[PDB]
Amino acid sequence: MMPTPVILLKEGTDSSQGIPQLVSNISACQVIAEAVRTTLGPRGMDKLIVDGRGKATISNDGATILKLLDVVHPAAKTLVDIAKSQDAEVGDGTTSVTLLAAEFLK
Amino acid sequence: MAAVKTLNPKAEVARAQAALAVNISAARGLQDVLRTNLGPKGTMKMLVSGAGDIKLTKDGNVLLHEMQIQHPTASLIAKVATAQDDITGDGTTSNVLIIGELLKQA
Amino acid sequence: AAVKTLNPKAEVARAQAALAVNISAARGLQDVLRTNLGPKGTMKMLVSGAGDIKLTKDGNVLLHEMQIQHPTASLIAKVATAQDDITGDGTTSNVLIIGELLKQADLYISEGLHPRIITEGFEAAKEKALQFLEEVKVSREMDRETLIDVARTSLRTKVHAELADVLTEAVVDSILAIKKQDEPIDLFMIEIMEMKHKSETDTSLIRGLVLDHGARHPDMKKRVEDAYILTCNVSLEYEKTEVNSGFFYKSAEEREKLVKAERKFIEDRVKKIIELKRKVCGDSDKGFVVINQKGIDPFSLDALSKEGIVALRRAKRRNMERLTLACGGVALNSFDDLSPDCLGHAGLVYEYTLGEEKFTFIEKCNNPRSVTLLIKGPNKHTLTQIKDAVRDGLRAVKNAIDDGCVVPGAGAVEVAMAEALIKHKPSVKGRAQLGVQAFADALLIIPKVLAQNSGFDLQETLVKIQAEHSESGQLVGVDLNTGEPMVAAEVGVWDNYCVKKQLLHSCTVIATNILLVDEIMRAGM
Amino acid sequence: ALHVPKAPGFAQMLKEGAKHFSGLEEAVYRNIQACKELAQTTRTAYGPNGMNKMVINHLEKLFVTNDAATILRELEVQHPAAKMIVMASHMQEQEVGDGTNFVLVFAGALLELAEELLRIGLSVSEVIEGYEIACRKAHEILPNLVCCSAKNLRDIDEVSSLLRTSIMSKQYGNEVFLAKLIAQACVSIFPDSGHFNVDNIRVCKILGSGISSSSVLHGMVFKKETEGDVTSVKDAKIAVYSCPFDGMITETKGTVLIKTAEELMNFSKGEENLMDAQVKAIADTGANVVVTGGKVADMALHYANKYNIMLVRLNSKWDLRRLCKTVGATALPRLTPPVLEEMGHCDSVYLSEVGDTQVVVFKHEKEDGAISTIVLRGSTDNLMDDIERAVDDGVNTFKVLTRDKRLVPGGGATEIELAKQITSYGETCPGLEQYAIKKFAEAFEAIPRALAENSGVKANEVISKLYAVHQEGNKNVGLDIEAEVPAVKDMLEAGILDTYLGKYWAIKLATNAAVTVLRVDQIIMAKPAGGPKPPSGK
Amino acid sequence: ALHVPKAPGFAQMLKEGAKHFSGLEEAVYRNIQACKELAQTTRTAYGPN
Amino acid sequence: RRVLKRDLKRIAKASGATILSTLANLEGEETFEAAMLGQAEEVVQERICDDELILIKNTKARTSASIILRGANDFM
Amino acid sequence: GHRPVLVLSQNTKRESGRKVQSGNINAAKTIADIIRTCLGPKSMMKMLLDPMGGIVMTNDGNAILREIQVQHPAAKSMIEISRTQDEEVGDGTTSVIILAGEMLSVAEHFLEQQMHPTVVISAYRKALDDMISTLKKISIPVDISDSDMMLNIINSSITTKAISRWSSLACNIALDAVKMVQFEENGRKEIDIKKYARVEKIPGGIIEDSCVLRGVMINKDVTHPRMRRYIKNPRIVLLDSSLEYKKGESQTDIEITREEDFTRILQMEEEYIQQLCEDIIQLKPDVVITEKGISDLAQHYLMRANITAIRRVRKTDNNRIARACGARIVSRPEELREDDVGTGAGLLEIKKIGDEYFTFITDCKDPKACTILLRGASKEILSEVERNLQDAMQVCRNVLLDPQLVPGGGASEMAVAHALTEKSKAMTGVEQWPYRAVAQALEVIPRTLIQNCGASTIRLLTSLRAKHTQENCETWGVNGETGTLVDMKELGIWEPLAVKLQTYKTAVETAVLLLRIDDIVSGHKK
Numbered sequence A: 001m002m003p004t005p006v007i008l009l010k011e012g013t014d015s016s017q018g019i020p021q022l023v024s025n026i027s028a029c030q031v032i033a034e035a036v037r038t039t040l041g042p043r044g045m046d047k048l049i050v051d052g053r054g055k056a057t058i059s060n061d062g063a064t065i066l067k068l069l070d071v072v073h074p075a076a077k078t079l080v081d082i083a084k085s086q087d088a089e090v091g092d093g094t095t096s097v098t099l100l101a102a103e104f105l106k
Numbered sequence B: 001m002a003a004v005k006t007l008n009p010k011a012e013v014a015r016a017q018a019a020l021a022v023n024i025s026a027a028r029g030l031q032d033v034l035r036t037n038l039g040p041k042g043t044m045k046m047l048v049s050g051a052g053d054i055k056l057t058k059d060g061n062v063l064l065h066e067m068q069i070q071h072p073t074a075s076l077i078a079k080v081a082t083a084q085d086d087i088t089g090d091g092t093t094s095n096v097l098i099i100g101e102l103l104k105q106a
Numbered sequence C: 001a002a003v004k005t006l007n008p009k010a011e012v013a014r015a016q017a018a019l020a021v022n023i024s025a026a027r028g029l030q031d032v033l034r035t036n037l038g039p040k041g042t043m044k045m046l047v048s049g050a051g052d053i054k055l056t057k058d059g060n061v062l063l064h065e066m067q068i069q070h071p072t073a074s075l076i077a078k079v080a081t082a083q084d085d086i087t088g089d090g091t092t093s094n095v096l097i098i099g100e101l102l103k104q105a106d107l108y109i110s111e112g113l114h115p116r117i118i119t120e121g122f123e124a125a126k127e128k129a130l131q132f133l134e135e136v137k138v139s140r141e142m143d144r145e146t147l148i149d150v151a152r153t154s155l156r157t158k159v160h161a162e163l164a165d166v167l168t169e170a171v172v173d174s175i176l177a178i179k180k181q182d183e184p185i186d187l188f189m190i191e192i193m194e195m196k197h198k199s200e201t202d203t204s205l206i207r208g209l210v211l212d213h214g215a216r217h218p219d220m221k222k223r224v225e226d227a228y229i230l231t232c233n234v235s236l237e238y239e240k241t242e243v244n245s246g247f248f249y250k251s252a253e254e255r256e257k258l259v260k261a262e263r264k265f266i267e268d269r270v271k272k273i274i275e276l277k278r279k280v281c282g283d284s285d286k287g288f289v290v291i292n293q294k295g296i297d298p299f300s301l302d303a304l305s306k307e308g309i310v311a312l313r314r315a316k317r318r319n320m321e322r323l324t325l326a327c328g329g330v331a332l333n334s335f336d337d338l339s340p341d342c343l344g345h346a347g348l349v350y351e352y353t354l355g356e357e358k359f360t361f362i363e364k365c366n367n368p369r370s371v372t373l374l375i376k377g378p379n380k381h382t383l384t385q386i387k388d389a390v391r392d393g394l395r396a397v398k399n400a401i402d403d404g405c406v407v408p409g410a411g412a413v414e415v416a417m418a419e420a421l422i423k424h425k426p427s428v429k430g431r432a433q434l435g436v437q438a439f440a441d442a443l444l445i446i447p448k449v450l451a452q453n454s455g456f457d458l459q460e461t462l463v464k465i466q467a468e469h470s471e472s473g474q475l476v477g478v479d480l481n482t483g484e485p486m487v488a489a490e491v492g493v494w495d496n497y498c499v500k501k502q503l504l505h506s507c508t509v510i511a512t513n514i515l516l517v518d519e520i521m522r523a524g525m
Numbered sequence D: 001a002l003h004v005p006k007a008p009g010f011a012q013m014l015k016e017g018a019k020h021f022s023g024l025e026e027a028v029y030r031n032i033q034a035c036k037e038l039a040q041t042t043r044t045a046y047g048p049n050g051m052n053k054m055v056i057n058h059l060e061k062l063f064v065t066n067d068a069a070t071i072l073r074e075l076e077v078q079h080p081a082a083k084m085i086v087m088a089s090h091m092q093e094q095e096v097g098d099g100t101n102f103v104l105v106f107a108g109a110l111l112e113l114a115e116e117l118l119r120i121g122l123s124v125s126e127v128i129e130g131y132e133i134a135c136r137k138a139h140e141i142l143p144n145l146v147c148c149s150a151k152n153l154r155d156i157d158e159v160s161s162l163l164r165t166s167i168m169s170k171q172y173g174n175e176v177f178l179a180k181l182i183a184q185a186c187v188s189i190f191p192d193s194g195h196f197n198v199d200n201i202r203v204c205k206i207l208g209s210g211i212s213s214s215s216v217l218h219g220m221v222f223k224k225e226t227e228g229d230v231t232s233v234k235d236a237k238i239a240v241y242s243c244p245f246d247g248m249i250t251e252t253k254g255t256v257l258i259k260t261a262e263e264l265m266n267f268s269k270g271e272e273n274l275m276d277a278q279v280k281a282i283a284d285t286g287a288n289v290v291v292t293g294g295k296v297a298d299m300a301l302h303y304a305n306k307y308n309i310m311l312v313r314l315n316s317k318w319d320l321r322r323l324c325k326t327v328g329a330t331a332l333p334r335l336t337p338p339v340l341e342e343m344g345h346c347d348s349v350y351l352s353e354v355g356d357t358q359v360v361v362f363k364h365e366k367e368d369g370a371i372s373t374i375v376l377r378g379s380t381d382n383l384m385d386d387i388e389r390a391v392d393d394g395v396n397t398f399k400v401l402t403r404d405k406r407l408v409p410g411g412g413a414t415e416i417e418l419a420k421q422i423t424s425y426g427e428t429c430p431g432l433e434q435y436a437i438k439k440f441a442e443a444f445e446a447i448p449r450a451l452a453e454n455s456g457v458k459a460n461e462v463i464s465k466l467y468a469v470h471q472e473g474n475k476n477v478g479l480d481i482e483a484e485v486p487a488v489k490d491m492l493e494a495g496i497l498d499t500y501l502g503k504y505w506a507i508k509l510a511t512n513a514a515v516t517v518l519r520v521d522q523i524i525m526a527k528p529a530g531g532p533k534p535p536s537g538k
Numbered sequence E: 001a002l003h004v005p006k007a008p009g010f011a012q013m014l015k016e017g018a019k020h021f022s023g024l025e026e027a028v029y030r031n032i033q034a035c036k037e038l039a040q041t042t043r044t045a046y047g048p049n
Numbered sequence F: 001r002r003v004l005k006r007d008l009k010r011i012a013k014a015s016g017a018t019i020l021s022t023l024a025n026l027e028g029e030e031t032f033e034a035a036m037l038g039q040a041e042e043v044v045q046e047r048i049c050d051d052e053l054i055l056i057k058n059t060k061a062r063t064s065a066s067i068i069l070r071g072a073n074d075f076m
Numbered sequence G: 001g002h003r004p005v006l007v008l009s010q011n012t013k014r015e016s017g018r019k020v021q022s023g024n025i026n027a028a029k030t031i032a033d034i035i036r037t038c039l040g041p042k043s044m045m046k047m048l049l050d051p052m053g054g055i056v057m058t059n060d061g062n063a064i065l066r067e068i069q070v071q072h073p074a075a076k077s078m079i080e081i082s083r084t085q086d087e088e089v090g091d092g093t094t095s096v097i098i099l100a101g102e103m104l105s106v107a108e109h110f111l112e113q114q115m116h117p118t119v120v121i122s123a124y125r126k127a128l129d130d131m132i133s134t135l136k137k138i139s140i141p142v143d144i145s146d147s148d149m150m151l152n153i154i155n156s157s158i159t160t161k162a163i164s165r166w167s168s169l170a171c172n173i174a175l176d177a178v179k180m181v182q183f184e185e186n187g188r189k190e191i192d193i194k195k196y197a198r199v200e201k202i203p204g205g206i207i208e209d210s211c212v213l214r215g216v217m218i219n220k221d222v223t224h225p226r227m228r229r230y231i232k233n234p235r236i237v238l239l240d241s242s243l244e245y246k247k248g249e250s251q252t253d254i255e256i257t258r259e260e261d262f263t264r265i266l267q268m269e270e271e272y273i274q275q276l277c278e279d280i281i282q283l284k285p286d287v288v289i290t291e292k293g294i295s296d297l298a299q300h301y302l303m304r305a306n307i308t309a310i311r312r313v314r315k316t317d318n319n320r321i322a323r324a325c326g327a328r329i330v331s332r333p334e335e336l337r338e339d340d341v342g343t344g345a346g347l348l349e350i351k352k353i354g355d356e357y358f359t360f361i362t363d364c365k366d367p368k369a370c371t372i373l374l375r376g377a378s379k380e381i382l383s384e385v386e387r388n389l390q391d392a393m394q395v396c397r398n399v400l401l402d403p404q405l406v407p408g409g410g411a412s413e414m415a416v417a418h419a420l421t422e423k424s425k426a427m428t429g430v431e432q433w434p435y436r437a438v439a440q441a442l443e444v445i446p447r448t449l450i451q452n453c454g455a456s457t458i459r460l461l462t463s464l465r466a467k468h469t470q471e472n473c474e475t476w477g478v479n480g481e482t483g484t485l486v487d488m489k490e491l492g493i494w495e496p497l498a499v500k501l502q503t504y505k506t507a508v509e510t511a512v513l514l515l516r517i518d519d520i521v522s523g524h525k526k
């Protein structure tokens, strides 16, 4: 590009456009699904998450695990949001929603 | 602001009337310094170098070389006066005065 | 330097250095402000530190919004500020004339001449120029057409041609509305209210008032056809006792009695208002509007709305006089003795909602001595520019009315005055003729800058105009469309006589004072 | 001879952080470049095939949308010319509610072609006058392009058909359902009086069930719970109070002065008896529901529970006023029992749970009322926010239709016809303004070009076909987005229509912004201050 | 209005550490003062005493 | 007003007046008698170099003196 | 460790001997050189940059000296003597500085030649006494009744300032203001122009429009718009107490137990305001001016009686109004008397100048206060004009108090120098040399006048000295603009005797004070 002595947007504005950003979004959703993947089924396993204060949370619940995870990716937050939605409306299947959405995207 | 500054961010450019004003100001400053040299009724100038050497002179070229000036137009006029001294050996102060007055009248 | 020996951290410019610094600053300001002059000027953009955007070509606004830190620039800025404060126009011409005077003076000072002679020539030329200006002014009956011409001459230089055309009618009509015969014009009786919802050409004149606030009670009527206006300055909300009253009770019933009896003072005034409303209008045909400078608590608002009364609270202080002059009632500070004769009348009152803000219109007055101009535009900077333009136009029209004289514009008077100064120069004794010539050359800057802004060449246009004036003797200016000499009086390009006189006086005084400065000091630290 | 000093005059007098740009190349071309870049940023969201954008503001708040006004609002635009363009877009949003992206695209095209004209030799004033003349000609032409009118607004089917196009650009996949919802909500509102209030449509966002489960309610929904024990009422007689549900106190200072033992032993009992008497007096009028704007005392709550009175506490005064409008009650300033005219009636008030949130519903049964509420479901907060923006656009379109009922064909048909006729007019005008008029006409091509680019077809083929068809005499033919190849079809039969007022105001504002940007010749920018926002913005 | 800029011309083209004194007061009187100071410095060692 | 305490004592002693911190006699009343009045031959609000001061000239029942010093500046 | 042991504290410097004297004299000489070129009718103006951002463009020496900051204490003493000269007589601030610098310069010569400073000081005191004697001997009397002579004196006092162009109007304004302010009560003559001759500067207009009013003018407006803005012959009542309802001094609290007490208290507040206004109205005034606020109910009650009110005026402005219109400021209107009612103002007009309202109480009969309304180009021009007017008024007051005059343009300096030189011939001691030195150092004023005029100093000074060596040539000075010797009986440049006496005394005592000083000690704190 060019320096453009006076610029349009504020300095530090990061923008990503096109196919690569969509592929990165799909990859982020895959990463989010991986973090709760092994909690599904009668043979599922618990996850332990420690916050800054030092308290540990152990849960097999997908929504709880996702909430304890502090996700900042704009596209990855959608999976956490739909997990919360499933927990609110139904209360069960919060792992299945994330797995299905990530599998669709993949 | 300018095209050159856009290509080279740390570039100093004086354009349009600015260049003419800068050149005329430099020429007028040189002329103002060298006015007092002209004629047998001129005034001695004492020039002290960095090492502390004392030089008494009224020669226009000698004064120009020992002037603490770092200006482009001043450098051009100094080179012209140097050629004047080299070939004819006289008229350096008159050279500078005539150049400055030509620029002012223009 | 002598001063630096006492204060080492002091900055001093002495002898020719002071003149060089002052003239350089004046020339820089003149070079910036050249492009403002004339309707063909260039529009400037001013972005503040916070990011606000202002579009203008006004000289005073540009000077205040330039990022300049120079002493001589501050002096010229103060001179232009006084110019704007008193006359309201001519700041750009002020700066141009100051800069050209300094440049022409330097033209002779650089050749070994002492500035005192130049100042003497300046004073002589100023006296002769004032005499010529008195001789050349055109005394006229300030009818509507002449005021429209003056308003056009200002607004066209201030804003777009069509917007200027609308603003001419608006400003002239407002001034003619508020003007009493043989009485100074009070510009405080013109409220400049701005709305931000339509196009710039929607600016109009309302023969009444527009208030930036509306009724605070939802049940109050949004439109009243025939209204009795009660302009009051009485607090209608709960007020504490000044002597720390406090309450003391021994039961809940006593508390209820004290609560009900603590509102009686305000309720008495509310009941007085309601009784007056009932007496004045016994039917539902007429309406009642109460405009209060002080707040109204919700209880009083409910009590008033139960009687079909529209009440506006926290009105501006100037609105008291504005409503008194427009509606025709009287501002009241108490309700001790209020009679149907203290009520104003308005032929239409309604409320307008624009986003969060709400506005109240009061129109169809009998003979409104106070009116308002409603500025409408899609942007904030458009509103600010239109406000500056209407201020300039109102000042121009008021100045034209104040003295029945008016001066031809387009730089014609400058050319004729310079010619008269050249003719009078031989009569001046001594070397002050050089100062007189410098003053004439400086006065000739206005046609030069007008020719630049119109795109023509300075020398050809100037010599053509001067030759035409010498051959015919008329007042010929600059035709910004063709460049030919043209009689400004015939086409209707008028300048304010007071503006020209102030220009001459202020420019000559400041130039004389600046030329005599030989040292600039900063040693207060 | 190693440095270039600043020129004497204004260059030296400038402040340390200030910037001065003067002349064509330094100011006008830079402004045009900035506006073109802003238009490029906002271009890809135009049309039904527009793509959503995730915009994160300085407070880490997500905004996934294809609404140009919202995107510009959440963008930290710094170039002042782009600031004028954004202000014009926001003004268009305020005046009409739709067409902001049109404003951006048209302003960008106008400024690009103005830069071209300045390069080829025209002066700024000539370009400005040509643009203004062409704008006047376009405004003169526009009424002649009206194809049909609303011709009724109390209907449901045709109102939904009219509103479909407005909310077809956003939520392209499922717009019929949203059109039906918004049509029902708007038809409930808009009584015999011609005045239509946008604020009378309320949007309630409840998470969990997907947007297909959204409904419209003839009433108000509050995400609160009942204060008392009663949770359902079948013949509500709501009495609304703007005062706290407690015994009022002196405004100066309260001090219970006790001087005997009997007063001390009787004060609290008498206060409780007074509270009971007030509550029973309120209940005796038949008011089985009480809504208050302040806090609720314990004794008042107990005595309300004793007489089977449903309590709802509304903190917001706006909510209180809206409830008063919906039910038809007057917010009493004191705790006196309400007279028959001041008592509001709602056909059903009850406590319900939708998904997870507990809500209180003031439900009517008649297909009428002052205020209607749309409950929005979904799986994400951002998705519900986008649906809310679409509902706002639909409601604004309905309001515009109430104002003016004329419509013009969409999908670039109106733009192409305008470009053709403006070019025809400019071909006859002599003088240098013909170039500016022709460029103004050509600037209309940016709308169908953007539509074709977003749809994924060749823009040039679509534009050439549109010119051919319009030359044949078909003024209602626009881009057909339901095709994999460049194709066009009549948009009157397709029902893809745009409001006349929207096009008129968008064209006017875009032209005004473009000419205002072109008018700027010099820029003087102060040093960017570090102040914590201007005091005007608090 | 808080700083005095350097005068255009020679005063702006002067180097950083350089100095320029012109006129009677700035040059001649200063030179005479310096010579007077040197004379006072050496005066007391004159003569047999 | 705001007369310095030491200045008041000298004036009262020189003029024959009496300082009264309160108006109260030995009879419990609030009275003022002529016996507590000092006398002077003149009192003038004289002007001294853009400032002003009080000159109580020629007090009776006692002779006092004061000196006003003039100089180039406050240092002198 | 082992911190060093010292007798005096750290950073306590000390200089002594010939160096201290040389430094003091050089500092005084430099201070003189700063304003040397601002003397005479051909003086050039200076631009001063305030640390607060303001600009002081002035020709007055005292302003220039007070607007700069110095570190050498001798320069501080010079600034102090300049301020003293400005405060005492009002002008001559450059002359005293130049004279002190020259006297110290000529005393340095004797200090370098093994002469103790006490001898020089004694010679200086003898010379000062003889200068006073000669100045009193060569003075001339003036009758203050002749207005033309007073105008000429003021002109000669203002020809050296920037107002010399409008000198005629300036002299008329200054003379009118000084004559109007002049007052006498209880046998005490008083000319107090600091408090009762106010200069108000309003930018814009032309300086020819400036005038002195037969009254006062304040930046005030009516409290209520319906109040009259134009009253022909107003009866004025002045107050300095609020017309509102304020709390008492004691900690007072009410205890309300009955229903009707609250409204009763509020109604008694209203009734107190009404009674206060009725007590005011009983005198039947036309306007009311207060230094404290006026309540809205008070405004209503005053308006019911057709009375204009001005709300919040300053103490000094109220005193000026009382002097101008013959009123008497009172606090409790229940004690208002007929004598306190101000009658004598001939018109009260409230008109808008520019964009602000101004109140005029002009047209008074026999006013004892005045307002000099100044209109001009800008703030700096008006400030300089105000300084020049202050100089003119000070000169007028000096002439009124002391009707003696002495020739100007250096004639007095040359005459006194010649008299001192002639008297020195009879001296036989060593004191004669510094005596003659200061006598001829007094000649710096004509030398500076010639230098600023641009003429040749040596031959003009020699010719002037030769002329003064004659018998009846004590009034021969120099033109400040043409560089020629002219008798001052013809040119007409004369100065008050008091100004010259003060200048000579201040210069001589400053020289004495700076001569007495040795062994500067600095560095210690308070």
Ligand SMILES: Nc1ncnc2c1ncn2[C@@H]1O[C@H](COP(=O)(O)OP(=O)(O)O)[C@@H](O)[C@H]1O
Residues within 6 Å of the ligand: B037, B038, B039, B040, B059, B060, B090, B091, B092, B093, B094, B095
């Ligand atoms: N005695 C004189 N009388 C008059 N003019 C002279 C005299 N001597 C020299 N000049 C003139 O003065 C000028 C001296 O210029 P000069 O200082 O020599 O400049 P440069 O050193 O550059 O040649 C010459 O052009 C000459 O004509």
Ligand SMILES: Nc1ncnc2c1ncn2[C@@H]1O[C@H](COP(=O)(O)OP(=O)(O)O)[C@@H](O)[C@H]1O
Residues within 6 Å of the ligand: C036, C037, C038, C039, C058, C059, C089, C090, C091, C092, C093, C094, C153, C154, C156, C157, C408, C409, C410, C411, C446, C450, C477, C478, C479, C480, C493, C495
């Ligand atoms: N239509 C016109 N034709 C020719 N000259 C004009 C026209 N309108 C204004 N002028 C001249 O141009 C000048 C405009 O100056 P202006 O921009 O108003 O500066 P200011 O705002 O400082 O007065 C006026 O002096 C007037 O004589």
Ligand SMILES: Nc1ncnc2c1ncn2[C@@H]1O[C@H](COP(=O)(O)OP(=O)(O)O)[C@@H](O)[C@H]1O
Residues within 6 Å of the ligand: D045, D046, D047, D048, D050, D068, D098, D099, D100, D101, D102, D103, D165, D168, D169, D170, D409, D410, D411, D412, D451, D479, D480, D481, D496, D498
């Ligand atoms: N079904 C459709 N087929 C083709 N074009 C359409 C269709 N629906 C809407 N459009 C076009 O899309 C444009 C609306 O774009 P939109 O994203 O709403 O931007 P804005 O909100 O600024 O109007 C309209 O000009 C219309 O012509």
Ligand SMILES: Nc1ncnc2c1ncn2[C@@H]1O[C@H](COP(=O)(O)OP(=O)(O)O)[C@@H](O)[C@H]1O
Residues within 6 Å of the ligand: G038, G039, G040, G041, G043, G060, G061, G091, G092, G093, G094, G095, G096, G156, G157, G159, G160, G161, G408, G409, G410, G445, G449, G478, G479, G480, G481, G493
């Ligand atoms: N017309 C004149 N011709 C010659 N000398 C004059 C004239 N007017 C004033 N002077 C001299 O100028 C001196 C006043 O200078 P001024 O600028 O007032 O300095 P200062 O304020 O210190 O008195 C007086 O001593 C007087 O002798």
Ligand SMILES: [Mg+2]
Residues within 6 Å of the ligand: A092, A093
């Ligand atoms: Mg499960």
Ligand SMILES: [Mg+2]
Residues within 6 Å of the ligand: B090, B091, B092
């Ligand atoms: Mg030579």
Ligand SMILES: [Mg+2]
Residues within 6 Å of the ligand: C089, C090, C091, C154, C157, C392
């Ligand atoms: Mg103008």
Ligand SMILES: [Mg+2]
Residues within 6 Å of the ligand: D098, D099, D100, D166, D169, D393
């Ligand atoms: Mg849209």
Ligand SMILES: [Mg+2]
Residues within 6 Å of the ligand: G091, G092, G093, G160
């Ligand atoms: Mg003086």
